[PDB]
Design a protein around this nucleic acid. Structure first.
Ligand SMILES: [K+]
Ligand SMILES: [K+]
Ligand SMILES: [K+]
Ligand SMILES: [K+]
Ligand SMILES: [K+]
Ligand SMILES: [K+]
Ligand SMILES: [K+]
Ligand SMILES: [K+]
Ligand SMILES: [Mg+2]
Ligand SMILES: [Mg+2]
Ligand SMILES: [Mg+2]
Ligand SMILES: [Mg+2]
Ligand SMILES: [Mg+2]
Ligand SMILES: [Mg+2]
Ligand SMILES: [Mg+2]
Ligand SMILES: [Mg+2]
Ligand SMILES: [Mg+2]
Ligand SMILES: [Mg+2]
Ligand SMILES: [Mg+2]
Ligand SMILES: [Mg+2]
Ligand SMILES: [Mg+2]
Ligand SMILES: [Mg+2]
Ligand SMILES: [Mg+2]
Ligand SMILES: [Mg+2]
Ligand SMILES: [Mg+2]
Ligand SMILES: [Mg+2]
Ligand SMILES: [Mg+2]
Ligand SMILES: [Mg+2]
Ligand SMILES: [Mg+2]
Ligand SMILES: [Mg+2]
Ligand SMILES: [Mg+2]
Ligand SMILES: [Mg+2]
Ligand SMILES: [Mg+2]
Ligand SMILES: [Mg+2]
Ligand SMILES: [Mg+2]
Ligand SMILES: [Mg+2]
Ligand SMILES: [Mg+2]
Ligand SMILES: [Mg+2]
Ligand SMILES: [Mg+2]
Ligand SMILES: [Mg+2]
Ligand SMILES: [Mg+2]
Ligand SMILES: [Mg+2]
Ligand SMILES: [Mg+2]
Ligand SMILES: [Mg+2]
Ligand SMILES: [Mg+2]
Ligand SMILES: [Mg+2]
Ligand SMILES: [Mg+2]
Ligand SMILES: [Zn+2]
Lengths: 119, 192, 45, 235, 46, 110, 57
RNA sequence: UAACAGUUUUAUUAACCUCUGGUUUACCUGUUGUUUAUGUGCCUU
RNA sequence: CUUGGCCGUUAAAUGCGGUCUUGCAUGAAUGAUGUAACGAUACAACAGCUGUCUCUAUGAUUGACUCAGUGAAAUUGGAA
RNA sequence: GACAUGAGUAACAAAAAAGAGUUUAAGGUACCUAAAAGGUAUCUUAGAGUCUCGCCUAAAGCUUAUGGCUACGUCAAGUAACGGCCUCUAAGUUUAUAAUCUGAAGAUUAUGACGAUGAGAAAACUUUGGUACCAACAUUUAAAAGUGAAAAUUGUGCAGGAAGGAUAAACCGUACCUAGAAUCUGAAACAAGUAAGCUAGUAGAGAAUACGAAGGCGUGAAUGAGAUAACAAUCAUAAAGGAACUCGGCAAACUAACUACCGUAACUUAGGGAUAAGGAGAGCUCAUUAGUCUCGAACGAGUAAAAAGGAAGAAGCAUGGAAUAUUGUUGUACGACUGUUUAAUUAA
RNA sequence: UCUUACUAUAGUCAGGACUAUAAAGGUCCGAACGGGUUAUCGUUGCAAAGAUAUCCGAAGAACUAUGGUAAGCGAGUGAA
């Protein structure tokens, strides 16, 4: 459940290390796995994104439990995301870490294509 | 707005409500009967019947739980696992009885009751039924179906049984306890 | 007393008159030499 | 934790019957002590003269009693001998105009100071067991349990009658380890001679019966000098 | 509003201020006594 | 399910007021109840206010039938149903859906 | 209060539906035949029987 | 034919505890200080 | 005049800090000016922290409600 | 002035708390019994007590003051175990005297008198100026040891620390109350306020914190019994997020105490900053012991001795285990600083 | 007899820490005690100035007690 002023961990090679949520795109309810948001980069890693840049991101895993159709619930230890452009393509070329499996149904095939392990 | 109450709180705190029930069950076992308010007699009845179930167990966990309910275990534990255990060996539940009475305190006019131990030395329904049979035999009347039903209730599980009930009736006639009792055949003719 | 220094292990009850009252008839704390005999009864005033 | 006894018949070590509950008399509940089987116990580790005389003071209005080895009492006695018996019932000090000598016990042995320190010990333990563990006065006699906490504390302050019955008991061998016995163990035992000085001749009749080893004298030494004349029944 | 100005008040300061000797021994105090005596007061002072 | 006398938050979803920024005794209250003289000088009919809530009939529409067991006597339906366990409910074909096939309506009658 | 409540309206509130209800759940006692309350014990027999079991037993 | 696999989102109103959580002031377990009652309790000949 | 211009801080600065050759109407014991230390003074930022909030829910006690006892007050031209 | 309305409504909620027996006096009922009486049971009024439970506890306990619309059998030559009266005087007062000044009233200086909040011989019998002084602070001292006073000894700092007199038992006080349970001040039976001494023990550096022995209390029906809705007060917990709240982090939460531990920046009036920051340790069991102590016979043994002690070990989610001590850092304005201020809306 | 200042005689300030001192400091942490910073409650209140929590000082320009002095044409006292 990502909302305004929520700190996330960016797990792609786009240049950001810690982004802050500024807007939930397309809904009023707090964003869960596979939902769009507008973040503000607060930390970087050493056309990368500079600290203070505004980008769109996709929640890949959250710390709030996510129930599934078959009753299987998942819970991660932190809230993460990957930066995207307004068109919907990921900025980064590689994702390091486990991503949520709820991205398949939410039309995020490209993000899962380079996802090493799904949970 | 929330859930319903599990039991009666009796306008007391948690710690104060547990000591009230441990004191009512302590006075009941010690004295065999208590006269209190009806809500207290019904809240202590559930704890008095769960303490007598611990007196019919063979494990030590029951002896430690019964020690944590009474306020003078050293003086009352022998009676619990002694006389009380022997009395209720054959009875499957229902060791206590709550009987409504007139307000014990006339200032507040609060409904009161008498919590007592069945088949005990101070059973009020055993003496009230013996006084009804003592008045029926001294007035040449016929006991009602409700009296015959109570005569069997108070004599089924009692040790001496009928013999202890006939002696109670005999003592209530040699004492003239039914003197001045209005005959039941003249109740329809009395306005007051 | 084996150890006498002022820091010796304390194993005595420093509250001498513990649970002791005359109005409530609590009784003597310890057993005295006169505790096994009947209290002498005087002639009233 | 305390343990109160019950007013049940028990045996006495004294030669007389102290109370009606006393079943037997002159019963040996323990072998003679070290100094009991001794013809002449002495003031081994006490000052010269200590133990030869024992004074007893009492409140002439309320009956509170105090025992002292010296001819005068101090503030230590009032604190260490008077238990709390209610509000406004324990004096904050000793008032010279209320406290007078009740009696004075003098032993025959002019230097057996150890025999007096024992009599003073049983008198103080009996007085403590009269203000505490008074099961024999709860439902009989004064019936202290049938009185209010105020009146009950006023009857507990009146230890003058009890104290006199304590003297006839202790001086008659009451108590275990009483040093007023004398076992020869050649095994015959007897009681040591004693003398009791009374400021009031009528104060010695609180004891139903006195032993045969006590002699009663009127007036206490040092009383006449204070212009206080003793009370004589015969007059 | 009023205050508790008589808390801790002693009765020795009542005789020194509004006592009888404080009035018979002073020129202005004889007036008070004579005034109160003419009116018929019983409590001339304190 | 009966809920007794309910307030404004539970009965009408009122947001309530602040918790610590100076609020005096008005944390769960309804607030204002209408306008002044120009609005009628009265509380208007239909005003949402505290009162008893629950213990009223409620219909749930379009619930499929998952299981039908004659021996047990149960008819399992998807979703939730109004009331407490042990309460009597009325089950009937949906009104916003086409009736069951003609063949079935005759088979059951047969 | 803006105006004093009249006698008519104050009598409406005090007696309209607030009459004292007469207890009709009474029945005689089986041991003595006194008027006791339904489902309740006879107070005259309770005290007497409670005192009769204390003397002898 | 069988089998296997896939067949919207947001907002809002209400109901509802199967699931995921929150709560648990007479439930179980662990534990600190201290008091009270009961039992028990050192060495040696 | 005015949210003065510029820079830093904020995703966004009428604020804060720095700076200007910046004074409708700064100024030198009605003292001028800059530090250490001190401050329940006033303003601003960071980290942590949290029911402050997203968005409330449940639980406890005392009142609130009912029965018994005692028994006020402001107020009131009269009121269907 | 009387009597209405609100209204038989609010209120009798200091977050201590009550439960079950027993009993005395007088009186009111019902029955027994009709020879009145008495007996049994119950209710009312005014009490008393027992068992259990809880609350206060460096108090809500005890002993006493100030004081008192509570009540009158409260008892002293003095010390131990007592004040006043009485003697001496301070700050001061004076319709005392003298002198002087002054529209009268009065005022002034000196002397006298009076004036405690101070000083006053002896007793567990008794009647000169550091050769100093008895302000503060520290130190030392009634010899088995420790502790708390008294008085004295010695020393330190500057802010430089009274006066005077000496040296056979009268008269007055004496009861109760000390503010959480019937008494003082607050218009009152008010959740406020008021002096001195004592104020168990465990545990600690401690009068902190927690428990609480005795004691008192859990109010004069000025209340009691139920029920446990909204809402209010006072609290507890909380998914994910963590100031998005708001004039503003208001409130709340985090943090916290302790060790003879480690370490600690810019700047600085060189003292500080600083307990900066940031880290480590803690309870239970135990190897080990130079001395001290104990036991037996130099040595041996012992923590049913105080301590020391270690990279030892055990169990649990957790050993600052419960309670007590309320974040850290940074840039400015104002005023150097500690302090003072509108008793009861502004504390700056 | 409140309160303000002065005055005489008296009393009180657990414990710990730093500092040149055994004792030399309008030093530090923190009870008693003394203040009354912020907040909520209360507002015909328990109180015509109270309750709870929090906060400040706590060897000093400190606090407290029993007396005394100065107040009402002019103004007594006043860290104002
Ligand atoms: K005033
Ligand atoms: K509030
Ligand atoms: K209207
Ligand atoms: K659920
Ligand atoms: K005198
Ligand atoms: K003149
Ligand atoms: K939360
Ligand atoms: K209000
Ligand atoms: Mg109630
Ligand atoms: Mg508790
Ligand atoms: Mg007295
Ligand atoms: Mg005063
Ligand atoms: Mg229901
Ligand atoms: Mg809200
Ligand atoms: Mg209109
Ligand atoms: Mg379920
Ligand atoms: Mg339990
Ligand atoms: Mg100038
Ligand atoms: Mg200036
Ligand atoms: Mg009522
Ligand atoms: Mg109304
Ligand atoms: Mg109402
Ligand atoms: Mg009410
Ligand atoms: Mg009667
Ligand atoms: Mg003089
Ligand atoms: Mg004096
Ligand atoms: Mg009060
Ligand atoms: Mg108080
Ligand atoms: Mg009063
Ligand atoms: Mg304390
Ligand atoms: Mg008291
Ligand atoms: Mg009570
Ligand atoms: Mg959480
Ligand atoms: Mg904001
Ligand atoms: Mg906003
Ligand atoms: Mg705050
Ligand atoms: Mg460790
Ligand atoms: Mg483990
Ligand atoms: Mg300042
Ligand atoms: Mg200051
Ligand atoms: Mg003000
Ligand atoms: Mg004054
Ligand atoms: Mg200081
Ligand atoms: Mg401090
Ligand atoms: Mg002030
Ligand atoms: Mg203020
Ligand atoms: Mg400070
Ligand atoms: Zn009957």
């Amino acid at each position: 459940m990502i909302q305004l002023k929520t700190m996330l961990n960016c797990i792609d090679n786009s240049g950001a290390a810690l982004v802050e949520c500024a807007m939930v795109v397309g809904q009023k309810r707090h964003a869960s796995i596979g939902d769009r948001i507008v973040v503000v980069v607060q930390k970087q890693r050493g056309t990368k994104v500079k600290r203070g840049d505004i980008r769109h991101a996709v929640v890949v895993r959250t710390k709030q439990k996510v129930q599934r159709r078959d009753g299987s619930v998942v819970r991660f230890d932190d809230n993460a995301c990957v930066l995207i452009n307004k068109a919907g393509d990921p900025i980064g070329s590689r994702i390091n870490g486990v991503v949520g499996q709820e991205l398949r149904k939410k039309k995020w095939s490209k993000i899962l294509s380079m996802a090493p392990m799904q949970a | 707005a929330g859930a319903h109450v599990k039991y009666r709180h009796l306008s007391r705190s948690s710690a104060h409500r547990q000591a009230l029930l441990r004191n009512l069950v302590t006075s009941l076992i010690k004295n065999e009967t208590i006269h209190t308010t009806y809500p207290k007699a019904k809240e202590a009845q559930r704890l008095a019947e769960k303490l007598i179930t611990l007196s019919k167990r063979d494990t030590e966990t029951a002896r430690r739980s019964a020690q944590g309910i009474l306020y003078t275990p050293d003086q009352l534990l022998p009676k619990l696992f002694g006389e009380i255990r022997e009395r209720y060996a054959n009875r499957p539940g229902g060791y206590t009885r709550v009987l409504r009475t007139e307000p014990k305190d006339q200032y507040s006019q609060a409904p009161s009751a008498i919590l007592e131990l069945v088949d005990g030395p101070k059973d009020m329904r055993f003496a009230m039924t013996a006084a009804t049979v003592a008045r029926d035999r001294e007035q040449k009347t016929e006991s009602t179906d409700l009296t015959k039903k109570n005569m069997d209730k108070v004599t089924r599980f009692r040790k001496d049984g009928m013999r202890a009930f006939e002696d109670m009736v005999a003592s209530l006639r040699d004492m003239k306890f039914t003197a001045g009792a209005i005959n039941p055949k003249e109740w329809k003719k009395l306005d007051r | 007393k084996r150890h006498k220094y002022p820091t010796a292990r304390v194993t005595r009850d420093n509250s001498k008159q513990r649970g002791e009252s005359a109005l409530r008839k609590s009784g003597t704390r310890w057993k005295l030499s006169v505790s096994d005999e009947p209290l002498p009864e005087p002639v009233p005033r | 934790s305390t343990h109160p006894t019950t007013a049940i018949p028990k045996p006495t070590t004294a030669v007389l019957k102290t109370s009606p509950l006393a079943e037997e008399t002159a019963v040996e509940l323990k072998s003679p002590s070290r100094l009991q089987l001794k013809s002449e116990p002495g003031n081994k580790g006490n000052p010269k003269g200590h133990g030869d005389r024992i004074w007893a003071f009492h409140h002439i209005e309320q009956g509170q009693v105090i025992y002292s080895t010296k001819p005068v009492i101090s503030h230590q006695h009032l604190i260490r001998q008077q238990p709390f018996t209610g509000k406004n019932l324990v004096p904050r000090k000793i008032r010279k105009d209320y406290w007078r000598p009740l009696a004075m016990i003098e032993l025959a042995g002019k230097d057996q100071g150890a025999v007096g320190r024992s009599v003073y010990q049983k008198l103080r333990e009996f007085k403590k067991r009269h203000e505490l563990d008074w099961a024999n006065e709860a439902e009989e006699g004064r019936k202290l349990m049938h009185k209010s906490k105020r009146e009950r504390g006023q009857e507990l302050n009146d230890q003058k009658p009890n104290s006199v019955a304590d003297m006839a008991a202790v001086l008659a061998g009451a108590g275990k380890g009483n040093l007023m016995w004398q076992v020869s163990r050649l095994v015959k035992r007897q009681l040591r001679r004693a003398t009791v000085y009374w400021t009031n001749e009528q104060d010695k009749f609180h004891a139903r019966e006195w032993s045969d080893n006590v002699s009663h004298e009127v007036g206490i030494p040092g009383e006449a000098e204070k212009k206080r004349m003793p009370i004589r029944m015969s007059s | 509003g009023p205050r508790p100005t008589m808390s801790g008040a002693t009765r020795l300061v009542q005789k020194r201020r509004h006592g009888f000797l404080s009035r018979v021994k002073t020129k202005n105090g004889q007036k008070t006594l004579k005034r109160r005596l003419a009116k018929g007061r019983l409590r001339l002072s304190a | 399910r009966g809920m007794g006398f309910a307030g404004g938050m539970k009965r009408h979803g009122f947001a309530g007021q602040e918790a610590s920024h100076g609020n005096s005794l008005n944390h769960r209250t309804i607030g204002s109840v209408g306008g002044s003289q120009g609005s009628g000088s009265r509380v208007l009919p239909g005003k949402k206010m505290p009162g008893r809530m629950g213990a009223q009939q409620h219909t749930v529409q379009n619930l499929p039938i998952l299981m039908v067991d004659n021996e047990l006597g149960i008819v399992v339906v998807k979703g939730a149903v109004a009331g407490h366990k042990g309460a009597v409910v009325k089950v009937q074909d949906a009104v916003k859906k086409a009736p069951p096939p003609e063949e079935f309506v005759e088979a059951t009658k047969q | 209060p803006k105006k004093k409540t009249s006698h008519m309206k104050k009598r409406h509130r005090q007696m309209a539906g607030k009459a004292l209800k007469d207890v009709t759940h009474l029945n005689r006692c089986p041991a003595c035949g006194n008027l006791k309350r339904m489902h309740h014990l006879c107070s005259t027999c309770l005290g007497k029987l409670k005192g009769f079991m204390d003397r002898n037993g």
